[PDB]
Amino acid sequence: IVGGKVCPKGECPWQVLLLVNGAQLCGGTLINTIWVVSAAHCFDKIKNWRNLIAVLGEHDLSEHDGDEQSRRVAQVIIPSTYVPGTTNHDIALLRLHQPVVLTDHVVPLCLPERTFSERTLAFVRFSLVSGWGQLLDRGATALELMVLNVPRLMTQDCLQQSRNITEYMFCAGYSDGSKDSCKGDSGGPHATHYRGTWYLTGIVSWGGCATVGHFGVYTRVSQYIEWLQKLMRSEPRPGVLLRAPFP
Amino acid sequence: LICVNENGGCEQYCSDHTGTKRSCRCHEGYSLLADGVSCTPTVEYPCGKIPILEKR
Ligand SMILES: C[C@H](O)C(=O)NCc1cccc(-n2ncc(-c3cc4cnccc4[nH]3)c2O)c1
Ligand SMILES: [Ca+2]
């Protein structure tokens, strides 16, 4: 995250850190005790699918404070329509091997109904994006969880104000090079507040971090609600990676 | 009251029905109050609330 602030410990309790061989891979969002939403592209180069770990309740990567909960990733589910190394349909649903325990420091973000998200949430101007990604373009990653308030653009406006955005994406942020999500943040939440509760509206995708004349690109979670809900009702299948039909 | 406008007055989710009818609903871990619009937690750690802030 470029140009944000430290998320005070416990204030982003849905944030997930994904590790592979102990190394930072991506972020994610907890939506239930066993389900995490992340970005498909995070998994483009995974060799050993068995070595993927999700950590909840993380804050400061330099220390252990006892609020962290680590789980093995049992399933990584990716839409059929996602093509590795691209941006469209950049979403993954991860099943944890064992539920996390909800605590003051570990709480799911609400996955909204599609109608609500489209009719109401899509019109809330500002939303929060968070992660342990790069603090600067071509810079070091963060040791403490960072958060940033970004405004959402209608796609027409995005295109105009920009110095390929599909219906499965949206733009948010700033064009002045001061504030953005960055490498290391992908998969993390774009969270939207409405009447006292927070909801998942986007996933940090990719494409150029805090580049002048460009906005951040996020996966438009509303397009995937039904897809996600169906999968969460399904039994696990052997083998970690599952490609599931979309729609 | 239509769901498309002002969320139908619902705190959370809204469904249109046949006629001048609307029903609000709440996410799991919440229940709907008698006002027919408000949602109140039913569990300790409802989704989308921040415990340290809810406590202060
Ligand atoms: C063949 C290459 O090794 C490969 O593709 N590996 C897969 C793989 C895994 C995990 C992460 C990444 N990865 N690389 C770059 C970005 C990224 C840039 C960016 C700008 N603004 C906002 C979010 C952003 N994210 C990113 O998330 C890539
Ligand atoms: Ca820690």
CSV table of C-alpha atoms and ligand atoms in Angstrom, one decimal:
chain,number,residue,atom,x,y,z
A,1,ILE,CA,0.0,0.0,0.0
A,2,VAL,CA,1.3,3.4,-1.1
A,3,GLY,CA,0.3,6.5,0.8
A,4,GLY,CA,-1.8,4.8,3.4
A,5,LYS,CA,-1.4,4.4,7.2
A,6,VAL,CA,-0.9,1.5,9.6
A,7,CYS,CA,-4.1,-0.3,10.2
A,8,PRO,CA,-4.3,-0.3,14.0
A,9,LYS,CA,-4.0,-3.8,15.3
A,10,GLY,CA,-7.4,-5.5,15.2
A,11,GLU,CA,-9.1,-2.9,12.9
A,12,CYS,CA,-8.7,-5.0,9.8
A,13,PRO,CA,-9.6,-8.4,11.4
A,14,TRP,CA,-10.6,-10.0,8.1
A,15,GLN,CA,-7.2,-9.5,6.5
A,16,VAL,CA,-5.4,-12.7,5.5
A,17,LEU,CA,-1.7,-13.1,4.7
A,18,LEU,CA,-0.9,-15.9,2.3
A,19,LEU,CA,2.5,-17.6,2.5
A,20,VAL,CA,4.3,-20.1,0.3
A,21,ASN,CA,7.4,-21.8,1.8
A,22,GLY,CA,7.1,-19.1,4.6
A,23,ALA,CA,7.4,-16.3,2.0
A,24,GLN,CA,4.8,-13.6,1.5
A,25,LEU,CA,2.7,-14.4,-1.5
A,26,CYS,CA,-0.5,-12.3,-1.4
A,27,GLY,CA,-3.3,-11.1,0.8
A,28,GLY,CA,-6.8,-12.4,1.2
A,29,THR,CA,-10.1,-11.8,2.9
A,30,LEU,CA,-11.8,-14.0,5.5
A,31,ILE,CA,-15.6,-14.4,4.7
A,32,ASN,CA,-16.4,-17.3,7.0
A,33,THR,CA,-14.4,-19.5,9.4
A,34,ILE,CA,-13.2,-21.8,6.6
A,35,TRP,CA,-13.3,-19.6,3.5
A,36,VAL,CA,-10.9,-17.0,2.2
A,37,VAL,CA,-11.3,-14.9,-1.0
A,38,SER,CA,-8.1,-13.9,-2.8
A,39,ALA,CA,-6.8,-13.3,-6.4
A,40,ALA,CA,-6.4,-16.0,-9.0
A,41,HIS,CA,-3.1,-14.7,-10.3
A,42,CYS,CA,-1.5,-15.3,-6.9
A,43,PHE,CA,-1.4,-19.0,-7.8
A,44,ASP,CA,-0.1,-18.7,-11.4
A,45,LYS,CA,3.4,-20.1,-10.4
A,46,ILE,CA,2.7,-22.5,-7.5
A,47,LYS,CA,4.7,-25.6,-7.7
A,48,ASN,CA,4.0,-27.3,-4.5
A,49,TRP,CA,0.3,-26.8,-3.7
A,50,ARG,CA,0.8,-28.4,-0.3
A,51,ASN,CA,3.0,-25.5,1.1
A,52,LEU,CA,0.4,-22.8,1.0
A,53,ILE,CA,-0.5,-21.2,4.4
A,54,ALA,CA,-3.1,-18.6,5.4
A,55,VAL,CA,-2.5,-16.5,8.5
A,56,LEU,CA,-5.3,-14.7,10.3
A,57,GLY,CA,-4.9,-12.2,13.1
A,58,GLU,CA,-1.6,-10.9,11.7
A,59,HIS,CA,-0.4,-7.4,12.2
A,60,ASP,CA,3.4,-7.0,12.6
A,61,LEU,CA,5.3,-9.5,10.6
A,62,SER,CA,8.4,-9.0,12.8
A,63,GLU,CA,6.9,-10.5,15.9
A,64,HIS,CA,4.6,-13.1,17.3
A,65,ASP,CA,2.0,-11.9,19.7
A,66,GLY,CA,-0.3,-14.9,20.0
A,67,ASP,CA,-3.3,-13.5,18.1
A,68,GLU,CA,-2.1,-15.1,14.8
A,69,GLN,CA,-3.8,-18.3,13.5
A,70,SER,CA,-2.2,-20.3,10.7
A,71,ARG,CA,-4.0,-22.8,8.5
A,72,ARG,CA,-3.1,-24.9,5.6
A,73,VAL,CA,-4.9,-24.2,2.4
A,74,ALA,CA,-6.9,-27.3,1.4
A,75,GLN,CA,-8.5,-26.0,-1.8
A,76,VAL,CA,-7.8,-23.2,-4.2
A,77,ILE,CA,-10.8,-22.6,-6.5
A,78,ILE,CA,-10.4,-20.6,-9.7
A,79,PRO,CA,-13.1,-19.6,-12.3
A,80,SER,CA,-12.8,-21.5,-15.6
A,81,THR,CA,-12.7,-18.1,-17.3
A,82,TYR,CA,-9.5,-17.0,-15.7
A,83,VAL,CA,-6.4,-17.2,-17.9
A,84,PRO,CA,-3.1,-17.3,-16.1
A,85,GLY,CA,-1.0,-14.1,-16.4
A,86,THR,CA,-4.0,-11.9,-17.1
A,87,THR,CA,-6.4,-9.7,-15.2
A,88,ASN,CA,-9.9,-10.7,-16.1
A,89,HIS,CA,-11.7,-12.9,-13.6
A,90,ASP,CA,-9.0,-12.5,-11.0
A,91,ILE,CA,-10.6,-14.2,-8.1
A,92,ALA,CA,-9.9,-17.3,-6.0
A,93,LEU,CA,-11.8,-19.0,-3.2
A,94,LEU,CA,-9.7,-20.8,-0.7
A,95,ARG,CA,-10.9,-23.5,1.7
A,96,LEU,CA,-8.9,-23.8,4.9
A,97,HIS,CA,-8.0,-27.2,6.3
A,98,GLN,CA,-9.5,-26.3,9.7
A,99,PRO,CA,-11.7,-23.4,10.7
A,100,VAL,CA,-10.1,-20.3,12.3
A,101,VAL,CA,-11.5,-19.4,15.7
A,102,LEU,CA,-13.2,-16.1,15.7
A,103,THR,CA,-11.7,-13.6,18.2
A,104,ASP,CA,-11.4,-9.9,18.7
A,105,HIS,CA,-8.6,-10.1,16.1
A,106,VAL,CA,-10.1,-12.6,13.6
A,107,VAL,CA,-13.5,-11.7,12.1
A,108,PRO,CA,-15.0,-12.4,8.7
A,109,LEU,CA,-16.0,-9.6,6.3
A,110,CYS,CA,-19.5,-9.9,5.1
A,111,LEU,CA,-20.0,-11.3,1.6
A,112,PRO,CA,-23.0,-9.2,0.4
A,113,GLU,CA,-26.0,-10.3,-1.7
A,114,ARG,CA,-25.5,-9.4,-5.3
A,115,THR,CA,-28.5,-7.1,-5.4
A,116,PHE,CA,-27.4,-5.2,-2.4
A,117,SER,CA,-23.9,-4.9,-3.7
A,118,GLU,CA,-25.0,-3.6,-7.1
A,119,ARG,CA,-27.8,-1.4,-6.0
A,120,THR,CA,-26.3,0.1,-2.9
A,121,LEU,CA,-22.6,-0.7,-2.2
A,122,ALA,CA,-21.5,0.2,-5.7
A,123,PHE,CA,-22.5,3.8,-5.0
A,124,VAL,CA,-20.6,4.2,-1.7
A,125,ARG,CA,-17.7,6.4,-2.8
A,126,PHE,CA,-14.9,5.4,-0.5
A,127,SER,CA,-13.7,2.0,0.6
A,128,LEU,CA,-10.6,0.6,2.4
A,129,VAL,CA,-7.9,-1.5,0.8
A,130,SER,CA,-5.2,-3.1,2.9
A,131,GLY,CA,-2.1,-5.3,2.8
A,132,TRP,CA,1.6,-5.8,3.6
A,133,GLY,CA,2.6,-4.9,0.0
A,134,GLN,CA,5.2,-2.4,-1.3
A,135,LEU,CA,5.1,1.0,0.4
A,136,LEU,CA,6.5,2.5,-2.8
A,137,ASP,CA,6.8,1.6,-6.4
A,138,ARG,CA,10.1,-0.4,-6.6
A,139,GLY,CA,10.2,-0.3,-2.8
A,140,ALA,CA,10.3,-2.6,0.3
A,141,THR,CA,7.1,-4.3,1.6
A,142,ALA,CA,5.5,-3.3,4.8
A,143,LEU,CA,6.1,-5.0,8.2
A,144,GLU,CA,2.9,-3.7,9.7
A,145,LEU,CA,-0.5,-4.0,8.0
A,146,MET,CA,-1.3,-0.9,6.0
A,147,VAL,CA,-4.7,0.5,5.0
A,148,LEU,CA,-5.8,3.1,2.4
A,149,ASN,CA,-9.1,4.9,1.7
A,150,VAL,CA,-9.8,4.9,-2.1
A,151,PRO,CA,-12.7,6.3,-4.1
A,152,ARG,CA,-14.4,4.2,-6.7
A,153,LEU,CA,-14.9,5.4,-10.3
A,154,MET,CA,-17.6,4.4,-12.8
A,155,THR,CA,-15.8,2.6,-15.6
A,156,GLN,CA,-16.7,5.3,-18.1
A,157,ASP,CA,-15.1,7.8,-15.9
A,158,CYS,CA,-12.0,5.6,-15.3
A,159,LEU,CA,-11.3,5.4,-19.0
A,160,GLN,CA,-11.7,9.1,-19.5
A,161,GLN,CA,-9.7,10.2,-16.4
A,162,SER,CA,-6.9,7.8,-17.4
A,163,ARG,CA,-3.8,9.3,-19.0
A,164,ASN,CA,-8.9,-2.6,-20.5
A,165,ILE,CA,-11.5,-2.6,-17.9
A,166,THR,CA,-14.1,-5.2,-18.2
A,167,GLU,CA,-17.5,-5.7,-16.4
A,168,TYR,CA,-15.6,-8.0,-14.0
A,169,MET,CA,-13.5,-5.1,-12.8
A,170,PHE,CA,-13.6,-1.6,-11.4
A,171,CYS,CA,-11.2,1.2,-10.9
A,172,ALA,CA,-10.5,2.9,-7.6
A,173,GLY,CA,-7.9,5.3,-6.3
A,174,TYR,CA,-6.0,8.2,-7.5
A,175,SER,CA,-4.3,9.3,-10.7
A,176,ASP,CA,-1.6,11.5,-9.2
A,177,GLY,CA,0.8,8.8,-8.2
A,178,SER,CA,0.4,9.3,-4.4
A,179,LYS,CA,-1.9,6.5,-3.3
A,180,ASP,CA,-2.5,2.9,-4.5
A,181,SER,CA,-2.4,-0.8,-3.7
A,182,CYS,CA,0.8,-2.4,-4.9
A,183,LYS,CA,2.6,-5.7,-5.4
A,184,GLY,CA,2.3,-7.8,-2.3
A,185,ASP,CA,-1.3,-6.5,-1.7
A,186,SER,CA,-3.0,-8.6,-4.4
A,187,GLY,CA,-5.8,-10.7,-3.1
A,188,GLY,CA,-6.5,-8.4,-0.3
A,189,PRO,CA,-9.9,-6.7,0.5
A,190,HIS,CA,-11.6,-3.7,-0.9
A,191,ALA,CA,-14.1,-3.3,2.0
A,192,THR,CA,-17.1,-1.0,1.9
A,193,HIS,CA,-19.0,0.4,4.9
A,194,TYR,CA,-22.8,0.7,4.9
A,195,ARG,CA,-24.9,1.5,7.9
A,196,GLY,CA,-22.5,0.2,10.5
A,197,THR,CA,-21.2,-2.9,8.8
A,198,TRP,CA,-18.4,-3.7,6.3
A,199,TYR,CA,-18.8,-5.7,3.1
A,200,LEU,CA,-16.5,-7.3,0.5
A,201,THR,CA,-16.8,-5.3,-2.8
A,202,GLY,CA,-13.4,-5.8,-4.4
A,203,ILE,CA,-10.2,-7.8,-4.6
A,204,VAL,CA,-6.9,-6.1,-5.2
A,205,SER,CA,-5.9,-7.4,-8.6
A,206,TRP,CA,-3.0,-6.2,-10.7
A,207,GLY,CA,-1.5,-4.5,-13.7
A,208,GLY,CA,2.5,-0.2,-12.3
A,209,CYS,CA,2.0,0.9,-8.8
A,210,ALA,CA,0.9,4.4,-8.0
A,211,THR,CA,1.6,5.3,-11.6
A,212,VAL,CA,0.7,8.8,-12.6
A,213,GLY,CA,-2.3,8.8,-14.9
A,214,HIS,CA,-3.6,5.4,-13.8
A,215,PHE,CA,-5.9,4.0,-11.2
A,216,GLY,CA,-5.9,0.8,-9.2
A,217,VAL,CA,-7.9,-2.2,-10.7
A,218,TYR,CA,-10.0,-4.4,-8.5
A,219,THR,CA,-12.0,-7.5,-9.2
A,220,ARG,CA,-15.8,-6.7,-9.1
A,221,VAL,CA,-16.9,-9.2,-6.4
A,222,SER,CA,-20.6,-8.6,-7.1
A,223,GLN,CA,-20.2,-10.6,-10.3
A,224,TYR,CA,-19.1,-13.6,-8.3
A,225,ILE,CA,-21.4,-13.8,-5.4
A,226,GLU,CA,-23.5,-16.6,-6.8
A,227,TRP,CA,-20.5,-18.5,-7.9
A,228,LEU,CA,-18.9,-18.2,-4.5
A,229,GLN,CA,-22.0,-19.2,-2.6
A,230,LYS,CA,-22.5,-22.3,-4.7
A,231,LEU,CA,-18.9,-23.4,-4.1
A,232,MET,CA,-19.2,-22.8,-0.3
A,233,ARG,CA,-22.1,-25.3,-0.3
A,234,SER,CA,-20.1,-28.0,-2.2
A,235,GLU,CA,-18.0,-30.8,-0.9
A,236,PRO,CA,-14.2,-30.7,-1.1
A,237,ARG,CA,-12.5,-32.6,-3.9
A,238,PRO,CA,-9.1,-34.3,-3.8
A,239,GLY,CA,-6.2,-32.2,-5.2
A,240,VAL,CA,-5.8,-28.6,-4.1
A,241,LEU,CA,-6.4,-26.7,-7.3
A,242,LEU,CA,-9.9,-26.8,-8.6
A,243,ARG,CA,-11.1,-25.0,-11.7
A,244,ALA,CA,-14.8,-24.4,-11.5
A,245,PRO,CA,-17.2,-23.3,-14.2
A,246,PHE,CA,-18.0,-19.7,-14.4
A,247,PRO,CA,-20.7,-18.5,-14.4
B,1,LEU,CA,-40.3,1.5,-0.8
B,2,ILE,CA,-38.4,-0.2,-3.5
B,3,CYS,CA,-35.1,-1.9,-2.9
B,4,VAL,CA,-33.4,0.1,-5.7
B,5,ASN,CA,-34.0,3.3,-3.9
B,6,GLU,CA,-32.3,3.9,-0.6
B,7,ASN,CA,-31.9,0.2,-0.2
B,8,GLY,CA,-35.7,0.0,0.5
B,9,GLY,CA,-35.0,1.5,3.9
B,10,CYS,CA,-33.3,-1.8,4.8
B,11,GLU,CA,-30.1,-1.9,6.9
B,12,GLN,CA,-28.8,-4.9,5.0
B,13,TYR,CA,-30.5,-7.0,2.3
B,14,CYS,CA,-33.8,-6.2,0.5
B,15,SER,CA,-36.3,-8.2,-1.6
B,16,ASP,CA,-39.1,-6.8,-3.7
B,17,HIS,CA,-42.3,-8.7,-3.7
B,18,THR,CA,-45.6,-8.7,-5.6
B,19,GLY,CA,-47.3,-5.4,-5.1
B,20,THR,CA,-46.2,-2.5,-2.9
B,21,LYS,CA,-44.3,-5.1,-0.9
B,22,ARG,CA,-40.8,-5.3,0.4
B,23,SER,CA,-39.0,-7.6,2.9
B,24,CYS,CA,-35.7,-6.8,4.5
B,25,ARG,CA,-33.3,-9.5,5.5
B,26,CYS,CA,-30.1,-9.8,7.5
B,27,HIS,CA,-26.9,-11.8,7.1
B,28,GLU,CA,-26.2,-14.9,9.1
B,29,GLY,CA,-25.3,-13.9,12.7
B,30,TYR,CA,-27.9,-11.1,12.7
B,31,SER,CA,-31.7,-10.9,13.3
B,32,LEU,CA,-34.2,-8.5,12.0
B,33,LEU,CA,-35.9,-6.1,14.5
B,34,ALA,CA,-39.6,-5.4,14.7
B,35,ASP,CA,-39.1,-2.2,12.7
B,36,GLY,CA,-38.7,-4.6,9.8
B,37,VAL,CA,-35.5,-2.8,8.7
B,38,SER,CA,-32.8,-3.0,11.4
B,39,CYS,CA,-30.4,-5.9,11.9
B,40,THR,CA,-28.9,-6.8,15.3
B,41,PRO,CA,-26.1,-9.2,16.0
B,42,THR,CA,-27.0,-12.6,17.4
B,43,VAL,CA,-23.5,-13.9,17.9
B,44,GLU,CA,-20.3,-12.6,19.5
B,45,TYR,CA,-18.4,-12.0,16.2
B,46,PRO,CA,-20.8,-11.1,13.5
B,47,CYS,CA,-19.3,-10.4,10.0
B,48,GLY,CA,-18.3,-6.9,9.1
B,49,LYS,CA,-18.0,-5.5,12.7
B,50,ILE,CA,-14.8,-4.6,14.3
B,51,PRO,CA,-14.8,-5.9,18.0
B,52,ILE,CA,-12.2,-3.4,19.4
B,53,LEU,CA,-14.3,-0.5,18.0
B,54,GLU,CA,-17.7,-2.0,18.9
B,55,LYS,CA,-16.4,-2.1,22.5
B,56,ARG,CA,-14.5,1.1,22.1
C,1,LIG,C1,5.6,-14.9,-13.7
C,1,LIG,C2,5.6,-14.2,-12.4
C,1,LIG,O1,6.6,-14.8,-11.5
C,1,LIG,C3,4.2,-14.3,-11.8
C,1,LIG,O2,3.3,-13.9,-12.5
C,1,LIG,N1,4.0,-14.9,-10.6
C,1,LIG,C4,2.7,-15.0,-10.0
C,1,LIG,C5,2.5,-14.0,-8.9
C,1,LIG,C6,2.2,-14.4,-7.6
C,1,LIG,C7,2.0,-13.4,-6.6
C,1,LIG,C8,2.1,-12.1,-6.9
C,1,LIG,C9,2.3,-11.7,-8.2
C,1,LIG,N2,2.4,-10.4,-8.6
C,1,LIG,N3,3.4,-9.8,-9.4
C,1,LIG,C10,3.1,-8.5,-9.5
C,1,LIG,C11,2.0,-8.2,-8.8
C,1,LIG,C12,1.3,-6.9,-8.6
C,1,LIG,C13,1.6,-5.7,-9.2
C,1,LIG,C14,0.5,-4.7,-8.8
C,1,LIG,C15,0.3,-3.4,-9.0
C,1,LIG,N4,-0.8,-2.8,-8.4
C,1,LIG,C16,-1.6,-3.5,-7.6
C,1,LIG,C17,-1.3,-4.8,-7.3
C,1,LIG,C18,-0.3,-5.5,-7.9
C,1,LIG,N5,0.2,-6.7,-7.8
C,1,LIG,C19,1.6,-9.4,-8.2
C,1,LIG,O3,0.5,-9.6,-7.4
C,1,LIG,C20,2.5,-12.6,-9.2
C,2,CA,CA,2.7,-10.8,14.3
